[PDB]
Amino acid sequence: ADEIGDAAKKLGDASYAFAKEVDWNNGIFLQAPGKLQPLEALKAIDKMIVMGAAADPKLLKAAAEAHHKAIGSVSGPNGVTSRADWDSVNAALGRVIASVPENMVMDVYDSVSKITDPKVPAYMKSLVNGADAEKAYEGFLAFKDVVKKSQ
C-alpha cells in the first residue's frame, strides 16, 4: 500500500461518475484530436517513447496488468470498467508518472497540446455531465499533488 493508492481512491470518488458517462465505444477516439499532423504527432510520440524508456519497468508491467484486469470487468452500454479497476488503473498510472523526471512528463503534455485542437476539450465535455467532468478534474488536481510528492 502507498500514498498514491490512497489518493487514487479519493480520485475515484471524484471521477467515477464521469467515467460512467463517457461512451468508451465511440469511434471518435481513433481520430486525430483536430487536424492530422504526422510530423508534429511523431514529435509527441517521441516524447512518450522517451518517457516509457525512463519509467520504472516493474511499474510499467504493473500498469499493463491493471489494464488487462480492467478490460475484464467492462460492463454496461458505455464500456466502463468497475469502480475498483478504475482506481487500480489510476494508481498504477500515478506510480509510473512518479517514476520519471517531471520535465519528461511536461514534454509529453506540451507536445500533445500542440496537436490538439482547442475545441476538443469542450466537445468531449459536452458529451458528459459538465458538473461531473469538473468534479473529476478537481479530483485529478488533488491526485497529482500526491503523485508529485512521490516523484
Ligand X SMILES: CC(=O)O[C@H]1CC(C)(C)C(=C=C/C(C)=C/C=C/C=C/C=C(C)/C=C2C=C(/C=C/[C@@]34O[C@]3(C)C[C@@H](O)CC4(C)C)C(=O)O/2)[C@](C)(O)C1
- Cα 16 to Cα 29: distance, rounded to the nearest angstrom: 19
Residue 116 binds ligand DGD (CB under 6 A):
yes
Burial 23-41 (b: 16+ CB within 10 A, else e): eeeeeeeeeebeeeeeeeb
Residue 148 binds ligand X (CB under 6 A):
yes
Q: Which grid cell sits at 138?
A: 478537481
Size of the site for ligand CL7 (CB under 6 A): 14
Q: Which is nearer to Na ion, 99 or 129 (CB)?
A: 99
- Would you mind telling me the total number of residues written for the chain in this entry? 151
Residue 49 binds ligand CL7 (CB under 6 A):
yes
- Cα 147 to Cα 5: distance, rounded to the nearest angstrom: 10
Q: Enumerate residues 60-89 that contact ligand X by CB under 6 A.
A: 60-61, 64, 67, 70-71, 74, 79-81, 86, 89
Residue 138 Cβ vs its own copies, minimum distance, rounded to whole Å: 29
Q: Which grid cell sits at 10?
A: 479519493
Q: Which residues bind ligand DGD (CB under 6 A)?
A: 29-30, 33, 108-109, 112-113, 116, 120-121, 134, 137-138
